[PDB]
Amino acid sequence: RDKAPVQPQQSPAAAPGGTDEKPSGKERRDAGDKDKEQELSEEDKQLQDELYRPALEELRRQIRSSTTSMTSVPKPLKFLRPHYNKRFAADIISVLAMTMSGERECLKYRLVGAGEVAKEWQELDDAEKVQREPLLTLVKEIVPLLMEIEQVDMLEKDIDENAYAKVCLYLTSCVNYVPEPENSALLRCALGVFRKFSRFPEALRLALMLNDMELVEDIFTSCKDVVMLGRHGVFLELSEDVEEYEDLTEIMSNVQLNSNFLALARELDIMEPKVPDDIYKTHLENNRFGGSGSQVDSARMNLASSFVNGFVNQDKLLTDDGNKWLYKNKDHGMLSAAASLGMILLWDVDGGLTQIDKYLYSSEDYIKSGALLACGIVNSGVRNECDPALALLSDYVLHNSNTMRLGSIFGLGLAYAGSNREDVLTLLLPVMGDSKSSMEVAGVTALACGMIAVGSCNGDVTSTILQTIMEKSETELKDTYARWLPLGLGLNHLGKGEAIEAILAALEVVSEPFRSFANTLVDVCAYAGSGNVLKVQQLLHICSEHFDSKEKEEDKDKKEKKDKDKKEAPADMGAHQGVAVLGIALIAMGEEIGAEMALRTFGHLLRYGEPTLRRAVPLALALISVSHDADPEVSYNSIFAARLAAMLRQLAQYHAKKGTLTLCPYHSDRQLMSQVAVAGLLTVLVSFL
Amino acid sequence: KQEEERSKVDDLRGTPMSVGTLEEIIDDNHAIVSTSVGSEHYVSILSFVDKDLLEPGCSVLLNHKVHAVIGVLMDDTDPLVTVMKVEKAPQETYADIGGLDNQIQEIKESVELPLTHPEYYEEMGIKPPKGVILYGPPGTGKTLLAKAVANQTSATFLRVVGSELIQKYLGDGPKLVRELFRVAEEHAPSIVFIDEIDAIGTKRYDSNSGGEREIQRTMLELLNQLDGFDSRGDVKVIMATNRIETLDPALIRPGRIDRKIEFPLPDEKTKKRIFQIHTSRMTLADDVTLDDLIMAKDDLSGADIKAICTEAGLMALRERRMKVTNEDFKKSKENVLYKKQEGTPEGLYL
Ligand SMILES: Nc1ncnc2c1ncn2[C@@H]1O[C@H](COP(=O)(O)OP(=O)(O)OP(O)(O)=S)[C@@H](O)[C@H]1O
């Protein structure tokens, strides 16, 4: 109707006209009024007036909430103590209490730091449990633990909307936009409601982000309570890091309850179903052995081809293909070929000893040292290959068993990940105290103790890596030491959630840009990735640093950091000119499934002239795809047809055919512009089943 | 610093700079430059730019006064590459099966199956079809089936119109052939499509040089490039026309184009489906019988059916009627065909 009868009712100040007009306005409050509430300029004078004055607070929050305010709007509701499935309930509850209580939670969440906003917050939580459309109420009620009692208060009936919808969008947006400390509340209260619930790989991805040891005991009494079985042994062992299968095999070495979790969840039963079934359902032919194994000769390309043939795995045929192929081979390639029988067969525990045993203790140092390297390759649960190598290791400067130290300290780094294995590190004290002029002694020292030490409890600054810091800064020689020791330093820094070890090594370490490059290595490895863009604008500024190798690793951190929100991962690094930066993006594509935009970047990155960068393209190019596939390969044949390029092409052919185990060895590969002695360890980036 | 070396390279240049088309390597870095009009001194090259980006005979940056080679040409964004390089795999593989079904199978097991599985020639020692002329009456589906294979694909599709190669400059069209087959070479295994090359033979222009001596040279560059040398391998190219009279048989011969594929204007058994589907997305008074329209036009294309099934709705919605009267179909078909003369003759078989 017209506002002529109802409009001058705001003019009197008598109590009965208010106490019946406000219930009369409550009936018309289903649409608020006729219109956009142009009573405001006349009824804002009624502020100073004071029986049913909380109903006057309802009118006042109704009209101030009706037009616009950020702090004075929820003040009549916090003064009101709301009192006295509907359209009106959707109005004053849904949009008005959602937006109004939302700005009260934001304004007091940023302002003060009461219980009133907790009571209103639980009331709105209950009202949106009535409304039952989550998603927006949830993401609003994150920013007020509050979210803990919100989840256990909310979770009674609906499982997959809160679990799938809430835990999907808030897990992804929590690692994406939100900082870290509330993600622990996600993980613990999600451990509560998922502890109530079935389909346990939600809790196993909670074990992925948590890395908790109680969780695997609860999910093994519960996932033994739910008797597939060896398959969750498989992605259990794939999912788990270095620590919790050794803590798991020690507390389950105590209890075990059927001993089949000691069977599955240490080793050997992720791997017993696969390799026969790998032979069975797949049938791989011979003309890539012969054709791709025919790609000419030259003891390099041929040597690489042995590696390519070797990583073929239809039987361990290229293993037992005669003799005179390794006799053509030379020292560090003899390491690569002695380890290549390791690479053909990362299973066959009993067959590993009886195949490598001919090449064990042979006439050649590289055959025996790469042979124990192969013993470290083939398995990770044997630990009886240690002692024939372990006993020999000491040489005190540069004898044979230091190369067995390289293959056996590295291959034993492949072998075990304990709570903290300490006996092998007490063996590692005369290794770094030995300090051979061979790089990969301290190389596989840092990398191997890092593989022992990735997933440490927020890292540690213990005397192991503290000792290799002090003995690192002891000798400033052969800067590959100053690169690959901060490798294993940052590997021990992995396992962090909140580590101040960048500040600790910042105080101990920093100097002339060898150890400032150690500073940027700890800066890389301590910062795995979250919504933490301040180090990304730090990346923007110190990306322009005149020393152009802290540029290399510091800009190289990007594929670790933004690996999930990968749409921003295309950047203009190719549009820059510091050619190692084009190398950095060339790393940053990598190996996943590799969409058309990535191969489109390999359109330009495929065509470059420097042999380390033209060498650098087919590696990640054929890692990212594990004609179509062979079309860029024959395009590389069109590129060259140097020797490096030929080797790079061979590597690409090999490629053609946050788990830390796939995170380490390519950052171990990042110093490739060097000797084949370095490439003798190039075959230790064991990141594929 | 770098600034003085860059300034000295910039002052090796003389600010009125020019562009000329080359022929041949002169291996010891002194060169010789045709222009457009070709006045050719023994020129040099400004030796900090890369001479060996480029194969023999292509445009570079020149000078006007000593004619010397200065810089590499710009990768000149002609209006072709944006159309030639097909951006997205668009749409319309088959919204409606039942249009051809004869040479759908043929184009499948002749274009997809040799290409997408190149391992059957291993068993049986057969060469792939390089060029297939898909042709027939106008308005059949040739462009449609081209787009159908363009979306239903795993190869980088390319789409070329035959009048894209017709520009008035001298040697322009042969250069466009050169960059065209560079586009056809440097993507992937690729499916090139060429259309309207029966609109190139009895054709002369006014924005043009000497007519029979212009695109004889361009189509001869097409001859010497398409299925000449520069080894064929796996590059799919499809050319399409309506008529065959203006075709030089030097390209029709084997080696260059293997399979010859017509398209029949369809039978009434599929006219019922094509008329139905063209009328599938409108309102229509369903009492009317399309079987009159289906039986009537004896050599209908699908553009006929397109214009009929849309223009009858246009004549009805012309006066804002949702559903169509049969005499609006009369008006539609007698607009669409000039003198709808298929009755007697005959008419009187009967
Ligand atoms: N999914 C389909 N299956 C079969 N036929 C179809 C399909 N979609 C459309 N058509 C028909 O295919 C015809 C395609 O017309 P076009 O071949 O492009 O005509 P056109 O472009 O004049 O051919 P020219 O003269 O050689 S350029 C349409 O008129 C439709 O009737």
From Swiss-Prot, chain A:
- The answer to whether the entry has keyword Cytoplasm is no
Domain of life of the organism encoding this protein: Eukaryota
Function according to Swiss-Prot or TrEMBL: Component of the 26S proteasome, a multiprotein complex involved in the ATP-dependent degradation of ubiquitinated proteins. This complex plays a key role in the maintenance of protein homeostasis by removing misfolded or damaged proteins, which could impair cellular functions, and by removing proteins whose functions are no longer required. Therefore, the proteasome participates in numerous cellular processes, including cell cycle progression, apoptosis, or DNA damage repair.
Offer a single GO CC term for the protein.
Answer: proteasome complex
Q: Does the keyword Secreted apply?
A: no
Species: Homo sapiens
- Which residues are recorded with the post-translational modification Phosphoserine? S11, S24, S292, S294
In-chain residues carrying the UniProt-annotated modification N6-acetyllysine: K478
This entry's Gene Ontology molecular function terms read:
enzyme regulator activity
Which segments show compositional bias classed as Low complexity? 5-16
Q: Which residues carry this modification: Phosphothreonine?
A: T19
Annotated PC repeats reside at 336-369, 370-406, 407-441, 444-478, 487-516
Q: Where is this region: Disordered?
A: 1-47, 550-572
Record text on subunit structure and interactions: Component of the 19S proteasome regulatory particle complex. The 26S proteasome consists of a 20S core particle (CP) and two 19S regulatory subunits (RP). The regulatory particle is made of a lid composed of 9 subunits, a base containing 6 ATPases and few additional components including PSMD2. Interacts with RPGRIP1L. Interacts with CRY1 in a KDM8-dependent manner.
Compositional bias, Basic and acidic residues, is annotated for 19-47, 550-570
Tissues expressed in = Found in skeletal muscle, liver, heart, brain, kidney, pancreas, lung and placenta.
Q: Which terms does the UniProt entry file under GO BP? A: proteasome-mediated ubiquitin-dependent protein catabolic process; regulation of protein catabolic process
Can you name this protein?
A: 26S proteasome non-ATPase regulatory subunit 2
Keywords, A to Z? Acetylation, Phosphoprotein, Proteasome, Repeat
> What lineage does UniProt assign to this protein's organism?
Eukaryota, Metazoa, Chordata, Craniata, Vertebrata
Its family? Belongs to the proteasome subunit S2 family.
From Swiss-Prot, chain B:
Name of the protein in its database record: 26S proteasome regulatory subunit 4
* Location(s) in or outside the cell: Cytoplasm; Nucleus; Membrane
Instruction: Give the sites of the cross-link named Glycyl lysine isopeptide (Lys-Gly) (interchain with G-Cter in ubiquitin).
Output: K147
Q: Which UniProt keywords apply?
A: Acetylation, ATP-binding, Cytoplasm, Deafness, Intellectual disability, Isopeptide bond, Lipoprotein, Membrane, Myristate, Nucleotide-binding, Nucleus, Phosphoprotein, Proteasome, Ubl conjugation
Q: Which family does it belong to?
A: Belongs to the AAA ATPase family.
Residue positions binding ATP: G136, P137, P138, G139, T140, G141, K142, T143
User: Biological process GO terms, please?
Assistant: proteasome-mediated ubiquitin-dependent protein catabolic process
Entry function: Component of the 26S proteasome, a multiprotein complex involved in the ATP-dependent degradation of ubiquitinated proteins. This complex plays a key role in the maintenance of protein homeostasis by removing misfolded or damaged proteins, which could impair cellular functions, and by removing proteins whose functions are no longer required. Therefore, the proteasome participates in numerous cellular processes, including cell cycle progression, apoptosis, or DNA damage repair.
A GO term from the CC aspect = proteasome regulatory particle, base subcomplex
Task: Fill in the subunit field for this protein.
Answer: Component of the 19S proteasome regulatory particle complex. The 26S proteasome consists of a 20S core particle (CP) and two 19S regulatory subunits (RP). The regulatory particle is made of a lid composed of 9 subunits, a base containing 6 ATPases including PSMC1 and few additional components. Interacts with SCA7. Interacts with NGLY1. Interacts with PAAF1.
Instruction: Using the record's annotations, give every residue carrying the modification N6-acetyllysine.
Output: K168
**Phosphotyrosine modified-residue sites:** Y349
Residues with the Phosphothreonine modification: T344
From start to end residue, where is composition biased (Basic and acidic residues)? 1-13
Q: Which membrane topology term applies here? A: Lipid-anchor
- Its domain of life? Eukaryota
What are the GO MF terms of this UniProt record?
ATP binding; ATP hydrolysis activity; proteasome-activating activity; RNA binding
The uppermost taxa in this organism's lineage are: Eukaryota, Metazoa, Chordata, Craniata, Vertebrata
Which disorder is it connected to?
Birk-Aharoni syndrome: An autosomal recessive disorder characterized by failure to thrive, severe developmental delay, intellectual disability, spastic tetraplegia with central hypotonia, chorea, hearing loss, micropenis and undescended testes, as well as mild elevation of liver enzymes.
Q: Where is this region: Disordered?
A: 1-14
